[PDB]
Amino acid sequence: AQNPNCNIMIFHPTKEEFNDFDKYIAYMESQGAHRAGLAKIIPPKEWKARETYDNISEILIATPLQQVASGRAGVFTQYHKKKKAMTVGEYRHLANSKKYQTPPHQNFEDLERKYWKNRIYNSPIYGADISGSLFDENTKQWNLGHLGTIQDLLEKECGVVIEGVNTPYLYFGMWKTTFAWHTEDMDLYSINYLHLGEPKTWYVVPPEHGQRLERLARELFPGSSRGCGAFLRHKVALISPTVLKENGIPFNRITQEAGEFMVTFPYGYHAGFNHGFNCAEAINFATPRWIDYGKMASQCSCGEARVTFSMDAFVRILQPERYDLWKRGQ
Ligand SMILES: [NH3+]NC(=O)Cc1nn[nH]n1
Ligand SMILES: [Cl-]
Ligand code: NA
Ligand code: NI
Ligand SMILES: [Zn+2]
């Protein structure tokens, strides 16, 4: 068995290997990459996403979200307070202001330590989930707005035609902006490209061990757990690497830099934080290997997790016994 310790693998496809997206995801899985829950893909040197990021400042962040924490430094929740609209240029200026700017630090490890020591004491502002794309239309390889749709994948695998659309999202980050522990909707894959700016640090639990994380989360966030049997889908809980190690939870970490792709695999729980001003693009995707995961994915039916219209068909077809209850939650 490949990658039995579930390490995060890093891949360097050639330009030729970068042509067929689906083929390369299957190749990475052949090497055991999926066992980790996350892989890094460094594009060939001949590749670029777009020509320059000089002209992005006018993009609107309609609802920037202030991420306010509650709890203790290693075990906290965050809630998203809505703020007034601003442009990407205005956001960038805010991110670089003394109130929000990355502190002086020695290296990624020193910054990580600062993050987990001091995150709760600040409330950074995040531009998330903005439908759009920064790939140029002429970029033919690894263009996150041109990948095979999940709807077509379901059709191809199981023979039925469903409604829905699958488009990418943009994210504008700043120091301390945080993504809580989660798997994707319906335990889909995700792919994430860091277009510009400062790094993003990732934590990930191997899929084969995702229930260990769930069990610790239920222990650490007892009220939330009583509220919903799939509360991690609310995307608000944070647990530090120190606390994960104290509790014996298998996990790995890696830092993504601008120009790099990260793929998350089905049922790979992940969390992390941005180092400073950045912009990323991401989208969920499927492969034939996902179908089994989709059929088995937990769902949140308490109301809190609210999701895209596209989800409906995936629950309806893959999880008919659960559909009525999930729909009520919606
Ligand atoms: N799937 N990708 C992630 O969860 C990464 C992310 N970064 N900001 N919000 N989420
Ligand atoms: Cl700090
Ligand atoms: Na490890
Ligand atoms: Ni994710
Ligand atoms: Zn819920």
Residue numbers in the entry: 11 to 340
What does the paper say about this structure?
The lead structure, compound 1, represents the molecule with the shortest distance between the two interaction motifs: only one methylene group separates the tetrazole group and the hydrazide (n=1). In the structure of compound 1 bound to KDM4D, a clear positive difference electron density for the ligand could be observed and the ligand could be modeled with 77 % occupancy. Its hydrazide group chelates to the active site Ni2+, which is a surrogate of iron. The mode of chelation is very similar to that observed in the binding of the natural 2OG cofactor.13m The aromatic tetrazole ring is sandwiched between the two active‐site aromatic residues Phe189 and Tyr181. The distances between the tetrazole and the centers of the aromatic rings are 4.2 and 4.9 Å for Phe189 and Tyr181, respectively; thus indicating an aromatic stacking interaction. The distance of 2.6 Å between the hydroxy of Tyr136 and the second nitrogen atom from the tetrazole ring indicates strong hydrogen bonding. All of the other nitrogen atoms in the tetrazole ring are connected to the protein residues through clearly defined water molecules. Superposition of ligand 1 with the 2OG‐bound structure shows high structural similarities between bioisosteres. In brief, ligand 1 was the most potent compound, with an IC50 value of 46.64±0.94 μm in a formaldehyde dehydrogenase (FDH)‐coupled assay. In the antibody‐based LANCE Ultra assay, the potency was as high as 2.38±0.37 μm.
The five members of the KDM4 subfamily (KDM4A–E) catalyze the removal of the methyl group from tri‐ and dimethylated lysine residue 9 in histone 3 (H3K9me3/me2). Herein, we present the first successful attempt to obtain high‐resolution X‐ray structures of both hydrazide and tetrazole moieties bound to the enzyme KDM4D. All structural work reported herein was performed on the catalytic core of KDM4D, which comprised amino acid residues 1–342. All of the ligands (1–7) reported in this study occupy the native cofactor binding site, which is in close vicinity to the metal binding site and the site binding the methylated histone lysine.
